[PDB]
């Protein structure tokens, strides 16, 4: 049976904040192609690790 997971939190170090925002927060990823994950997972940044 599926677990029915609903990933909605993305926590990453500071160095990945910009890339995570690009993944979720803009329509184009890095080349004007598209962003299938736009407005999908709300990313919170964290600096307590790494």
């Amino acid at each position: 049976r599926p677990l029915d997971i609903r990933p909605n939190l993305l926590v990453v170090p500071t160095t990945l904040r910009s890339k995570a925002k690009e993944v979720v927060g803009v329509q184009r990823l890095a080349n004007g192609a598209d962003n299938p994950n736009f407005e999908l997972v709300q990313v919170l940044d964290t600096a307590w690790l790494n």
Partner: protein
Amino acid sequence: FMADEYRYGVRSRCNVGFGFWQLAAMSTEELNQVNFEKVYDAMRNQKADGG
């Protein structure tokens, strides 16, 4: 004619500033994500004493 001053600046906090940029905004990640974002993350990842 003379106009006196007795002021001076301070190199106050070197842990809250960044410099030495090869500034450019004309690449997917070669000039944006490696210069401006590098400075960004370096500024927001500073640790007072670790942790």
